[PDB]
């Protein structure tokens, strides 16, 4: 299936409290594997996945230096955006970036992306074509023009089609035991009494990987999508995920409703009842 290498970057100014907080968290699919935190005791790029032990000391030195360099460019960016937006030096502001690439099952590039945001709102983003930029406002229009004269898009495209793709292939390889595994979910339903002869039925799915899963509650063959309560799939602390979906049904009518769990680790979908 497709695989992705994604980096979530954040720069937060802390007026009066010193230098801005700078962080980089990397992901291969749904697995955190590297991280840099400027507030760290000793700021260095560090492994977050066991399989990263295969990288030599030279890897960590290069990435750490890059991060420090990226930290500096973003300190300036924070100052700049204050000018663009005509804001005061005393406020805290944030810059967020999503950078990455995805490959098919055969390892070829499916797509690349890079998006920036200021204070929680879109700023500038590379277009699908990997050649043009799209600004969200006039301030971003200034950055767009600067980037066009500098040749940023050509430079970034080189990274997304080359480095990004090549290193993604390598990570998947060194960590295939982890990244290419499939933990099948384990499901179960719980019952909860409610006022007015009603009950809350909750269907749980635990310990699965990849994160992609489908939980549905049914009645008379039809899936009760509109009548479902549901949480976003969540990391459970050990590299696996969990999720639940609930439906409030009439007391004494519970047995009709069934829970269906769809996941790649289930050749045939799970079907449960309370």
């Amino acid at each position: 299936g497709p695989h992705s290498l994604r980096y979530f970057v954040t720069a937060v100014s802390r007026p009066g409290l010193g230098e801005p907080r700078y962080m980089e968290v990397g992901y291969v699919d749904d697995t955190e594997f590297v991280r840099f935190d400027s507030d760290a005791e000793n700021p260095r790029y560090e492994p977050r996945a066991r399989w990263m032990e295969q990288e030599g000391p030279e890897y960590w030195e290069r990435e750490t230096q890059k991060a420090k360099g990226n930290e500096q460019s973003f300190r300036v960016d924070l100052r700049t955006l204050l000018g663009y937006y005509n804001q005061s030096k005393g406020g805290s502001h944030t810059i967020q970036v999503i950078s990455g690439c995805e490959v098919g099952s055969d390892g070829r590039l499916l797509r690349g992306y890079q998006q920036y945001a200021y204070d929680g709102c879109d700023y500038i983003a590379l277009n699908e074509d990997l050649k043009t930029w799209t600004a969200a406002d006039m301030a971003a229009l200034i950055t767009k023009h600067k980037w066009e004269q500098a040749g940023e898009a050509e430079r970034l495209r080189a990274y997304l089609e080359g480095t990004c793709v090549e290193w993604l292939r390598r990570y998947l390889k060194n960590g295939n035991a982890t990244l290419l595994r499939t933990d099948s979910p384990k499901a179960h339903v719980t019952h909860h009494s409610r006022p007015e002869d009603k009950v809350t039925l909750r269907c749980w799915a635990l310990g699965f990987y990849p994160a992609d899963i489908t939980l549905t509650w049914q009645l008379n063959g039809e899936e009760l999508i509109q009548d479902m309560e549901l949480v976003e799939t969540r990391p459970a602390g050990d590299g696996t995920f969990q999720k639940w979906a609930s439906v409030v049904v009439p007391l004494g009518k519970e047995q009709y409703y069934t829970c269906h769990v769809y996941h790649q680790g289930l050749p045939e979908p799970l079907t449960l009842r309370w």
Binding site: G69, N70, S73, I124, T143, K146, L156, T163, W167
Partner: peptide
């Protein structure tokens, strides 16, 4: 591997 030497904003 991360991107570097990016044009400032």
């Amino acid at each position: 591997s991360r991107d570097h030497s990016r044009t400032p904003m």
